[PDB]
Amino acid sequence: KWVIDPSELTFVQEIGSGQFGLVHLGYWLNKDKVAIKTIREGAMSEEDFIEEAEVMMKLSHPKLVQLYGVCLEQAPICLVFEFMEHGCLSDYLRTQRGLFAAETLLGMCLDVCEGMAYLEEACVIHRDLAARNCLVGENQVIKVSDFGMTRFVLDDQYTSSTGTKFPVKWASPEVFSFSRYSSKSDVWSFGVLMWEVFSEGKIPYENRSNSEVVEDISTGFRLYKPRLASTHVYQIMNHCWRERPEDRPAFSRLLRQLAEIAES
Numbered sequence: 375k376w377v378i379d380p381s382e383l384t385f386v387q388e389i390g391s392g393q394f395g396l397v398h399l400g401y402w403l404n405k406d407k408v409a410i411k412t413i414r415e416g417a418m419s420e421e422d423f424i425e426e427a428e429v430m431m432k433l434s435h436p437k438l439v440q441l442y443g444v445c446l447e448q449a450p451i452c453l454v455f456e457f458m459e460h461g462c463l464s465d466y467l468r469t470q471r472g473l474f475a476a477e478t479l480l481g482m483c484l485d486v487c488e489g490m491a492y493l494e495e496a497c498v499i500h501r502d503l504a505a506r507n508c509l510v511g512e513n514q515v516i517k518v519s520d521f522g523m524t525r526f527v528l529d530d531q532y533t534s535s536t537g538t539k540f541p542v543k544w545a546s547p548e549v550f551s552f553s554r555y556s557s558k559s560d561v562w563s564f565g566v567l568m569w570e571v572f573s574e575g576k577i578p579y580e581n582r583s584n585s586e587v588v589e590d591i592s593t594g595f596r597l598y599k600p601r602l603a604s605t606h607v608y609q610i611m612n613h614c615w616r617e618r619p620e621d622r623p624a625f626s627r628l629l630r631q632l633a634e635i636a637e638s
C-alpha cells in the first residue's frame with residue numbers, strides 16, 4: 375500500500391522550500407532515509423492523485439526517483455520520495471559550472487533518456503521534463519522525477535497553454551498550441567533538457583518572453599549550439615526539436631543513438 379501512517383515517518387532536517395511547501399530529509403520506518411515533501415492545501419487535486427496510486431506506485435527504474443507513498447491522515451499531506459543527495463540537476467549544473475567533462479554531461483543526458491524510455495514503454499507522459507525536475511544522487515546518477523504531476527496542479531496559469539506561467543520553454547508546438555501531450559512532446563522537452571545540460575544550467579530562451587518563444591519556434595528558430603555539445607550531440611538535440619511529433623525520434627531510438635556516441 376501507498377498510504378504511509380504519520381507514525382511511520384520522522385522529520386530530521388529541512389532540505390528546503392519547494393513550490394507546494396517544505397521538503398525535509400527524514401526516515402521512513404523499517405525502510406530507508408527519505409525526502410518528504412509537504413503539500414500546501416489547494417496546490418493539487420489530492421483526490422485525483424490518490425486514485426492513480428495503486429497503478430503508479432508500481433513504476434520503478436534505477437533512473438526514476440521513487441515516490442514511495444503518501445502520508446495523508448490530516449492536511450497538509452506529505453509525499454515520500456527516495457533521497458537524492460545532490461539535489462536538482464539545474465542547481466547542480468550551475469554550482470559545478472566549468473568542472474564538467476563533456477562525457478559526464480553526455481552521461482547525464484543518457485541517464486534521463488533511459489528513465490524516459492522506461493516511461494515511454496510504460497505509456498507514461500512526463501508533461502514537464504526539465505533539468506529542475508531531475509535529481510542528482512550518489513555517484514552523480516541523474517534520475518527523472520515529477521512525471522505526470524501537472525495533471526493534478528491547481529494553478530491554471532501554469533497548466534493551461536494560454537496561462538501566464540505555462541512552461542513554454544520546454545513545450546513542443548503541439549503542446550503550446552493544443553496541450554497535445556505525448557512521449558513525442560516529452561522528446562522535445564528532452565531536447566531542451568539536453569541543452570540545459572551541455573550549457574551547464576543556463577536558462578533556455580532567457581532573452582525572450584513566452585509569446586516571443588512561441589513565434590521564434592513557429593518560424594523555425596532553435597536554441598544555439600552549447601560550446602560543450604559536439605556536432606553529433608547538437609544534431610540529436612535538433613532531431614528532438616522537429617516541428618511534427620512523428621518526425622521526432624522515440625526515446626528508445628534516442629537511447630540507442632546517444633549510447634553509440636558515448637560508447638564511441
Ligand SMILES: CCOc1ccc2cccc(-n3cc(NC(N)=O)c(C(N)=O)n3)c2c1
Nearest residue numbers: 376426427430433439440441443519520522
Ligand atoms: C504512491 C504514488 O502514487 C502516485 C499517484 C499518482 C501518480 C500520478 C503521476 C505520477 C506518479 N508518480 C510519480 C513518481 N515518482 C516521482 N519521483 O515523481 C512515481 C513513482 N512510481 O515513483 N509515480 C503518481 C504516483
